[PDB]
Amino acid sequence: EVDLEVYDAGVSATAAVGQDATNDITLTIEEGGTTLSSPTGQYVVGSEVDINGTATSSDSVAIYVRDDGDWQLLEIGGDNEISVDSDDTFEEEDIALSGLSGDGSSILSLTGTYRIGVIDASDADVGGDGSVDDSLTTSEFTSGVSSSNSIRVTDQALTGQFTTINGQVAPVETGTVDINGTASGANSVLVIFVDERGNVNYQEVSVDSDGTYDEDDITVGLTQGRVTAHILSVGRDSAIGDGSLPSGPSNGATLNDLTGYLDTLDQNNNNGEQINELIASETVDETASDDLIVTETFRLAESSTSIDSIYPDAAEA
Amino acid sequence: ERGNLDADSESFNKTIQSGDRVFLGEEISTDAGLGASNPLLTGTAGNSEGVSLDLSSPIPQTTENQPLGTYDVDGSGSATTPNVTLLAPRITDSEILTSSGGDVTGSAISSSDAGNLYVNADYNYESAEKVEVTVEDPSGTDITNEVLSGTDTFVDDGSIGSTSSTGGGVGIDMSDQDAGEYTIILEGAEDLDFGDATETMTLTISSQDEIGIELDSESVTQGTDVQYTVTNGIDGNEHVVAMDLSDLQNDATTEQAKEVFRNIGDTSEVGIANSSATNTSGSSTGPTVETADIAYAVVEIDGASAVGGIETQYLDDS
Amino acid sequence: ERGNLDADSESFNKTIQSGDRVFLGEEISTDAGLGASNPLLTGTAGNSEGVSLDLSSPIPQTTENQPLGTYDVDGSGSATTPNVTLLAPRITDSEILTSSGGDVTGSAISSSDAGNLYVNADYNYESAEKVEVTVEDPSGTDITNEVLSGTDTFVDDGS
Ligand SMILES: *[C@@H]1O[C@H](CO)[C@@H](O)[C@H](O)[C@H]1O
Ligand SMILES: *[C@@H]1O[C@H](CO)[C@@H](O)[C@H](O)[C@H]1O
Ligand SMILES: *[C@@H]1O[C@H](CO)[C@@H](O)[C@H](O)[C@H]1O
Ligand SMILES: *[C@@H]1O[C@H](CO)[C@@H](O)[C@H](O)[C@H]1O
Ligand SMILES: *[C@@H]1O[C@H](CO)[C@@H](O)[C@H](O)[C@H]1O
Ligand SMILES: [Ca+2]
Ligand SMILES: [Ca+2]
Ligand SMILES: [Ca+2]
Ligand SMILES: [Ca+2]
């Protein structure tokens, strides 16, 4: 409870502390239950997620991560603060939790169960700083207006599917297939087609922010025969295989870097089986990388059409 | 100083000098100038002739007793004396704009975008009384001293459209205040606050809302152009409406792609673009139908919404 | 150029010259001509005498405060100065016709017969501001740049 007291007209400011109030009015004050809504429960490492919640009685907020220790701040913004609207609601969508410089990001970058909390920016600092403090202990985080939730970061998952007409492909001159699937946690996906004769083709697909990818009208410019397609996605390390390809850069080997290695496989005298074995040994089995692939096979047959059965609208097949 | 209030930084001046204009409703001082030398004046020509004027008393705010014109000491006589030209107070125009430019008066603006709002106005009576701005919340309480931003409460005449506090206008901030309708009242410093001498503009502070795209229909056949509407954007700003080239028919050439969007209505420009280059309707040196990535229309929203259109030909039946 | 907008292909001109007519609602520029030399003018005869006019401010669109007539520097005085003659904006006539001739305004015309429609109009204020045409669909959306055919959007007076 808190009261406002009016004083007699004409009284001075300094002298008014002594005399009794002519009248007064009282009112009650209650705290604001700031809390988070979006990040809770399951989460996929490396995946961009939205952040939203309510921050009643606050103007700016900060987000901290905890695992059996102090709360570490995340460098979500330049000022490390999120403004609060007139509706006591804050939101900062499409942020990569695992892609930040702070130690909380590194903690969230490894699979496991952790805690994520929100605190008031005004209560965030503990030394008169004009910005959010980097680290706060349990007592400091609990004392101020704050809330916490349990989070559980898990490994990435990859799935895919090809649109085979009959298990084969459109005419060899313009063979066309489509791909779809889910690649949550990644930013780009690669697809490669290898024939039995050692010719290779590749294509890069930008996965949507929700983790679902769907590409249509992909041209397979290979020779007629058995052709194996592989779909590749980089793991947490964002490097293919060991990250040290036998050719080109030896560090930070991305899919675009792997295209350079692919460009040399076809020129060699290797066949389809040898190319498949080399790519499986280098991309996946090398140093037990976290990158994930899926496989499919199809025959690039020539156009063909035939009639199977003819019958009246009766019981016949 | 009469005529030039900025000479002594005064908000007003009531020391009339021979020949200087005088507006309706002024309470002329009688201590200097014509206020003491010639307190009584007579009209010269037109409807003014015969009619008298007294500087020792406030001038009526209506023309029914003080017709507009030139007033002399001799009136209709051939003698030319210290004269007074009577006019009417009037605010020609007023606007509320953003520091980047663009009128936002009466519209809905988010709290974050109201950081550096400016109020400008052009009026008639700058030679006598500076105009003054009062900001009131939805409940009508004065909040001028709480939202004032680094400037006084006096708007200079002219300088309409100014987006900086260097000259003219008054800078205000509305980020701190909550959502609602706020009234900005411009009125004379002392006396000229009646009729055309005052104005009441409105501003709508709202929560940050997403840019809403709407179509007049959902299921349409090919060849039937469809109009789309963009809403909840900042007035006088440019948005980009994009179409994925995957939905475009494969057999379509560059020209078909470069005409998916029309130049109808508020649309400012139409073309195609990729991550590196663009081909507009006025050129062909940009990306081809395969080289480009998407089709795009740059639209400049005016008011609260913008309207554009699309031709649904050369599009897949999905 | 005042009076002759086609001299510099301008769509308007607000540089008033001594004696040139001025219409209601004009926002006269104060950088050249009478806009800076004589910002204040006084009426001469009729209802105009006594009434004042300010070039530094937009002229009211109604005659209740700016009666039509000739305005001088000396007003009713015998001296003749740079004057301004005030009139009223007015569109005398307008029509929509077919390339073969024949007014078709307000009537019903087939889609095929609307290939080469023409819009013409005679008005009063060609000396100051060219008239401009805006085409709107039944829903009111501007379609001027989509239906324009090989000409600008400015209609010359007469013709
Ligand atoms: C009007 O201007 C005169 C001239 O400086 C000044 O003396 C008065 O105080 C002011 O009201
Ligand atoms: C009105 O009086 C002024 C001087 O006050 C004179 O300059 C004008 O010529 C007259 O009309
Ligand atoms: C965008 O289009 C240009 C040609 O206009 C091409 O050079 C680029 O490679 C493409 O991304
Ligand atoms: C009015 O005409 C003058 C004369 O050429 C020109 O200088 C101005 O720019 C125009 O507005
Ligand atoms: C009005 O003023 C013009 C010159 O501006 C003069 O030519 C006329 O004779 C006068 O009535
Ligand atoms: Ca390697
Ligand atoms: Ca890896
Ligand atoms: Ca006289
Ligand atoms: Ca005269």
Author numbering:
A (entry chain F): 353 to 669
B (entry chain A): 35 to 352
C (entry chain B): 35 to 193
Publication text:
Using electron cryomicroscopy of two-dimensional sheets, we report the atomic structure of the S-layer from the archaeal model organism Haloferax volcanii. This S-layer consists of a hexagonal array of tightly interacting immunoglobulin-like domains, which are also found in SLPs across several classes of archaea.
To this end, we purified native csg protein from H. volcanii cells and incubated it with Ca2+ ions. In the resulting mixture, we observed S-layer-like sheets with variable curvature, showing characteristic top, tilted, and some side views. The atomic model revealed that each csg monomer assumes an overall sickle shape and is organized into six β-rich immunoglobulin (Ig)-like domains (D1–D6 from hereon), of which D1 is highly divergent in sequence among other haloarchaea (Sumper et al., 1990). The csg monomers were packed into the sheet as hexamers. The 6-fold symmetry axis of the hexamer contains repeated interactions of D1 around the central pore, which is ∼13 Å wide. The pore is lined with negatively charged residues bound to metal ions, likely Ca2+ or Mg2+, which, in agreement with previous studies, appear to stabilize the hexameric interface critical for lattice formation (Cohen et al., 1991). The csg hexamers are packed into a p6 two-dimensional lattice, with inter-hexamer interactions mediated by domains D4, D5, and D6. A conserved α-hairpin motif in D5 forms a prominent trimeric interface, while stacked D4 and D6 from adjoining hexamers form an extensive dimeric interface, resulting in a lattice with almost no gaps.
